Amino acid sequence: IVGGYTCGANTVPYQVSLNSGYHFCGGSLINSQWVVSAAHCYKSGIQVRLGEDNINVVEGNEQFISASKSIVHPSYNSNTLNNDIMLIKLKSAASLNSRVASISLPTSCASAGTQCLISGWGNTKSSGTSYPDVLKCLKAPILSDSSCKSAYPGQITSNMFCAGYLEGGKDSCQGDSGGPVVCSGKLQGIVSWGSGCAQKNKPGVYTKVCNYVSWIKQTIASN
Ligand SMILES: [Ca+2]
C-alpha cells in the first residue's frame, strides 16, 4: 500500500496473509473455512495466516492454518486477469473471535464514488521498494467505468473496477494482491493489478466481487 497508514493491530480482522515460506499475497476470510483471494496469487503449498499484524513477529493472536484446497475461477485468464479470483479452503476451521472475523459478501455491486478500505503488507513505495511488517490501510474511492477504461484502454472488463486517485500518490501495490477492498462493510473488490503503483493516471484495478457471489456460494456448498 503506497500512501496509506498503519491500520492498527487486528482492526481489519478479515485480512489474511498467504504464506509459502514468506508472505506473498493477501486474502479475505469469508467464513470460518474459506478465504477469497486473487487467482494470480495461486501457489501450491499455501499456509493461511489469520490474526496477523506484524507478519515477522509472532504477537499472540495469530492462527496459522494450512490450505487443503485452492479453486481458481473456471474462467480465469492470467493474460488479461479477467476473473482474477480464487477460493482457498482451510484444513480446519478458524476460531472466530474479535481479531479473526469474516467479511460479508455483497448483495449489490458498489457504486462509483464510494470510499473503500484497501489493506495489505505490499510495497509502500511508488518508485523503489519497501515492505512493511505491519498491516497498512488506504481509503480509496471507486472510479467511474468510463474513467477506468480511459486509464487502461482495451484492458478493462465488466469483472474489473478501478479505485484510487488519478493524481497518483495513493494505491495498492505488489504484495497487496489478493487482499480486500471493503466498501459499506462488504467485500467488493480484490487487489488485482495496475500499471506500477500510485502513478499518475494509472489507478488500481480490482476484481469485481459482486459478479462472483453465485459462484462462491455454489462452490463452498459443494467443497
Ligand atoms: Ca504476527
Short mmCIF file of C-alpha atoms and ligand atoms in Angstrom, two decimals:
data_model
loop_
_atom_site.label_atom_id
_atom_site.label_comp_id
_atom_site.label_asym_id
_atom_site.label_seq_id
_atom_site.Cartn_x
_atom_site.Cartn_y
_atom_site.Cartn_z
CA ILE A 1 0.00 0.00 0.00
CA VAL A 2 1.57 3.32 -1.14
CA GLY A 3 0.44 6.49 0.61
CA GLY A 4 -1.50 4.59 3.28
CA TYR A 5 -1.49 4.46 7.04
CA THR A 6 -0.77 1.85 9.67
CA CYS A 7 -4.16 0.19 10.27
CA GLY A 8 -3.70 -0.72 13.91
CA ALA A 9 -3.39 -4.26 15.08
CA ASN A 10 -6.32 -6.50 14.27
CA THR A 11 -8.58 -3.62 13.16
CA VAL A 12 -9.04 -5.43 9.81
CA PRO A 13 -9.86 -8.87 11.27
CA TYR A 14 -10.85 -10.47 7.90
CA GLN A 15 -7.44 -9.67 6.36
CA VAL A 16 -5.27 -12.79 5.89
CA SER A 17 -1.68 -13.24 4.77
CA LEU A 18 -0.91 -16.10 2.39
CA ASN A 19 2.45 -17.65 3.20
CA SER A 20 4.60 -20.06 1.25
CA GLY A 21 7.67 -19.63 3.44
CA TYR A 22 7.18 -15.88 3.22
CA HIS A 23 4.19 -13.53 2.80
CA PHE A 24 3.25 -13.34 -0.84
CA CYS A 25 -0.38 -12.14 -1.14
CA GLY A 26 -3.39 -11.09 0.89
CA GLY A 27 -6.85 -12.62 1.11
CA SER A 28 -10.15 -12.17 2.92
CA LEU A 29 -11.76 -14.56 5.34
CA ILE A 30 -15.41 -15.05 4.23
CA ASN A 31 -16.34 -17.73 6.81
CA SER A 32 -14.55 -19.98 9.23
CA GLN A 33 -13.39 -22.38 6.46
CA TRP A 34 -12.81 -20.20 3.33
CA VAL A 35 -10.65 -17.37 2.04
CA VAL A 36 -11.17 -15.29 -1.09
CA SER A 37 -8.00 -14.15 -2.90
CA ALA A 38 -6.77 -13.38 -6.46
CA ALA A 39 -6.28 -16.27 -8.90
CA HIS A 40 -2.91 -14.73 -9.81
CA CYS A 41 -1.87 -15.46 -6.19
CA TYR A 42 -2.20 -19.21 -6.82
CA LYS A 43 0.73 -21.28 -5.46
CA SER A 44 0.72 -24.87 -4.30
CA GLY A 45 1.58 -25.24 -0.56
CA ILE A 46 -0.15 -22.16 0.94
CA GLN A 47 -0.48 -21.56 4.68
CA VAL A 48 -3.18 -19.06 5.64
CA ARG A 49 -2.19 -16.70 8.45
CA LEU A 50 -5.06 -15.05 10.29
CA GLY A 51 -4.97 -12.59 13.18
CA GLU A 52 -1.75 -11.00 11.83
CA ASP A 53 -0.49 -7.55 12.40
CA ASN A 54 3.37 -7.75 12.18
CA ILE A 55 3.92 -10.65 9.73
CA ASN A 56 7.52 -11.08 11.01
CA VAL A 57 6.74 -11.34 14.76
CA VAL A 58 4.50 -13.90 16.47
CA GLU A 59 2.47 -11.48 18.67
CA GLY A 60 -0.07 -13.92 20.12
CA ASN A 61 -3.31 -13.57 18.20
CA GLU A 62 -2.39 -15.48 15.01
CA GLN A 63 -3.95 -18.65 13.68
CA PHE A 64 -1.79 -20.49 11.12
CA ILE A 65 -3.83 -22.99 9.10
CA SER A 66 -2.66 -24.88 6.00
CA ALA A 67 -4.84 -24.72 2.90
CA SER A 68 -6.41 -28.03 1.94
CA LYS A 69 -7.75 -26.93 -1.47
CA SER A 70 -7.43 -24.00 -3.75
CA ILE A 71 -10.02 -23.32 -6.57
CA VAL A 72 -9.07 -20.77 -9.25
CA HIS A 73 -12.10 -19.37 -11.06
CA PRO A 74 -13.05 -21.59 -14.01
CA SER A 75 -12.73 -18.64 -16.43
CA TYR A 76 -9.60 -17.09 -15.01
CA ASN A 77 -7.42 -15.67 -17.81
CA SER A 78 -3.90 -14.99 -16.45
CA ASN A 79 -3.06 -12.86 -19.53
CA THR A 80 -5.78 -10.24 -19.00
CA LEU A 81 -6.51 -11.03 -15.35
CA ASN A 82 -10.18 -11.33 -16.23
CA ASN A 83 -11.87 -13.31 -13.41
CA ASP A 84 -8.93 -12.82 -11.06
CA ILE A 85 -10.46 -14.66 -8.09
CA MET A 86 -9.66 -17.82 -6.21
CA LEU A 87 -11.10 -19.64 -3.21
CA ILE A 88 -8.86 -21.28 -0.61
CA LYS A 89 -10.28 -23.85 1.81
CA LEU A 90 -8.62 -24.16 5.22
CA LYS A 91 -7.70 -27.63 6.51
CA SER A 92 -9.55 -26.83 9.76
CA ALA A 93 -11.92 -24.04 10.64
CA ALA A 94 -10.59 -20.85 12.11
CA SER A 95 -11.71 -19.90 15.61
CA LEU A 96 -13.63 -16.74 15.03
CA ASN A 97 -13.08 -14.01 17.60
CA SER A 98 -12.55 -10.29 17.92
CA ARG A 99 -9.27 -10.44 15.97
CA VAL A 100 -10.19 -13.15 13.39
CA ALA A 101 -13.51 -12.50 11.73
CA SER A 102 -15.27 -12.96 8.41
CA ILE A 103 -16.35 -10.29 5.97
CA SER A 104 -19.72 -10.36 4.31
CA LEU A 105 -20.13 -10.99 0.58
CA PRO A 106 -22.10 -8.28 -1.24
CA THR A 107 -25.67 -8.24 -2.34
CA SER A 108 -25.32 -5.37 -4.69
CA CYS A 109 -22.40 -4.08 -6.59
CA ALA A 110 -20.77 -0.96 -5.04
CA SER A 111 -21.30 2.44 -6.59
CA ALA A 112 -18.74 4.81 -8.34
CA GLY A 113 -17.63 7.36 -5.82
CA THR A 114 -17.89 5.04 -2.79
CA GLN A 115 -14.88 5.14 -0.49
CA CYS A 116 -13.49 1.68 0.29
CA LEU A 117 -10.83 0.33 2.66
CA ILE A 118 -7.92 -1.48 0.93
CA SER A 119 -5.31 -3.20 3.06
CA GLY A 120 -2.16 -5.30 2.85
CA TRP A 121 1.52 -5.90 3.51
CA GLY A 122 2.63 -4.88 -0.01
CA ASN A 123 5.22 -2.36 -1.14
CA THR A 124 4.87 1.13 0.20
CA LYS A 125 6.91 2.89 -2.48
CA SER A 126 5.80 4.04 -5.99
CA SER A 127 9.46 4.22 -7.02
CA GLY A 128 11.51 1.58 -5.41
CA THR A 129 10.93 -0.95 -2.63
CA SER A 130 9.99 -1.09 0.98
CA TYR A 131 7.82 -3.77 2.50
CA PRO A 132 6.23 -3.07 5.81
CA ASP A 133 5.94 -5.64 8.53
CA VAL A 134 2.70 -4.25 9.97
CA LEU A 135 -0.59 -4.07 8.05
CA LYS A 136 -1.21 -0.94 6.00
CA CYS A 137 -4.54 0.58 5.08
CA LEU A 138 -5.82 3.03 2.46
CA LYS A 139 -9.18 4.61 1.81
CA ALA A 140 -9.76 4.97 -1.92
CA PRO A 141 -12.86 5.79 -3.97
CA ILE A 142 -14.27 3.67 -6.75
CA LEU A 143 -13.84 5.43 -10.12
CA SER A 144 -16.40 5.55 -12.89
CA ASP A 145 -16.25 2.81 -15.51
CA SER A 146 -15.53 5.46 -18.15
CA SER A 147 -12.60 6.87 -16.25
CA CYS A 148 -11.24 3.29 -15.61
CA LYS A 149 -11.44 2.45 -19.32
CA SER A 150 -9.81 5.72 -20.33
CA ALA A 151 -6.90 4.89 -17.98
CA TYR A 152 -6.43 1.38 -19.38
CA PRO A 153 -7.77 1.35 -22.94
CA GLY A 154 -8.65 -2.10 -24.26
CA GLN A 155 -7.97 -3.75 -20.90
CA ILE A 156 -10.93 -3.30 -18.52
CA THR A 157 -13.65 -5.96 -18.47
CA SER A 158 -17.07 -5.87 -16.70
CA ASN A 159 -15.37 -8.03 -13.98
CA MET A 160 -12.99 -5.18 -13.02
CA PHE A 161 -13.28 -1.76 -11.45
CA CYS A 162 -10.75 0.98 -10.74
CA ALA A 163 -10.29 2.66 -7.42
CA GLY A 164 -7.80 5.30 -6.27
CA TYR A 165 -6.57 8.67 -7.28
CA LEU A 166 -5.66 9.79 -10.80
CA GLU A 167 -3.16 12.37 -9.41
CA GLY A 168 -1.06 9.45 -8.08
CA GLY A 169 0.47 9.00 -4.60
CA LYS A 170 -2.03 6.52 -3.10
CA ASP A 171 -2.64 2.94 -4.30
CA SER A 172 -2.27 -0.73 -3.57
CA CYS A 173 0.92 -2.40 -4.83
CA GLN A 174 2.93 -5.64 -5.24
CA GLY A 175 2.34 -7.88 -2.26
CA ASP A 176 -1.16 -6.46 -1.61
CA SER A 177 -2.57 -8.71 -4.41
CA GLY A 178 -5.46 -10.89 -3.36
CA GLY A 179 -6.38 -8.67 -0.42
CA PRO A 180 -9.64 -6.94 0.32
CA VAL A 181 -11.38 -3.85 -0.98
CA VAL A 182 -14.26 -3.33 1.53
CA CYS A 183 -16.99 -0.83 0.80
CA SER A 184 -20.10 -0.36 3.00
CA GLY A 185 -18.85 -3.19 5.16
CA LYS A 186 -18.82 -5.85 2.37
CA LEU A 187 -16.10 -7.36 0.20
CA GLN A 188 -16.47 -5.60 -3.12
CA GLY A 189 -13.00 -5.96 -4.59
CA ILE A 190 -9.78 -8.00 -4.68
CA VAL A 191 -6.42 -6.32 -5.26
CA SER A 192 -5.65 -7.44 -8.84
CA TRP A 193 -3.41 -5.19 -10.98
CA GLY A 194 -2.33 -1.74 -12.12
CA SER A 195 0.49 -0.14 -14.08
CA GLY A 196 3.15 0.40 -11.43
CA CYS A 197 1.78 1.67 -8.14
CA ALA A 198 0.46 5.12 -7.31
CA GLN A 199 1.48 6.58 -10.70
CA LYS A 200 -0.47 9.43 -12.22
CA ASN A 201 -3.44 8.31 -14.42
CA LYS A 202 -2.86 4.60 -13.55
CA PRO A 203 -5.28 3.76 -10.67
CA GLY A 204 -5.60 0.33 -9.14
CA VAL A 205 -7.69 -2.29 -10.85
CA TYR A 206 -9.72 -4.68 -8.73
CA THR A 207 -11.71 -7.85 -9.32
CA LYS A 208 -15.46 -7.05 -9.05
CA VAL A 209 -16.53 -9.49 -6.32
CA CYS A 210 -20.27 -8.85 -6.74
CA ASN A 211 -20.10 -10.71 -10.10
CA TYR A 212 -18.84 -13.86 -8.29
CA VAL A 213 -21.17 -14.33 -5.39
CA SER A 214 -23.21 -17.11 -7.00
CA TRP A 215 -20.03 -18.98 -7.98
CA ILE A 216 -18.58 -18.53 -4.49
CA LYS A 217 -21.81 -19.74 -2.81
CA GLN A 218 -22.20 -22.81 -5.02
CA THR A 219 -18.59 -23.72 -4.74
CA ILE A 220 -18.50 -23.51 -0.91
CA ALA A 221 -21.77 -25.53 -0.78
CA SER A 222 -20.04 -28.27 -2.75
CA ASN A 223 -16.44 -28.46 -1.30
CA CA B 1 2.49 -11.89 13.56
#
